[PDB]
Design a protein around this nucleic acid. Structure first.
Length: 49
RNA sequence: ACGAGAACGCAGCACCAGCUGUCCAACCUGAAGAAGA
């Protein structure tokens, strides 16, 4: 209902634990472009499911 | 009727005394329960 999600506060956000998403598991989209990172993600996830 | 006969190379005696199989050394290195249940 709120989804405030405080942001830009000196980077104080950590996805600690699990059962949240597959983005925190695979690390290639922090050094690519949105279309390019999603293309690489599609290439690597074609082998899964 | 032998340069002969008779005659134990034998008796006593600890291969023993002292001496750390010790000294140094990490079972140690590298490694998400996620993911479309």
């Amino acid at each position: 209902f709120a989804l405030d999600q405080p942001s830009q506060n000196q980077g104080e956000i950590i996805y600690i634990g699990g059962g949240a998403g597959f983005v925190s598991k695979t690390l290639h989209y922090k050094s690519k472009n949105r279309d390019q990172a999603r293309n690489d993600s599609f290439d690597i996830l074609k082998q899964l499911f």
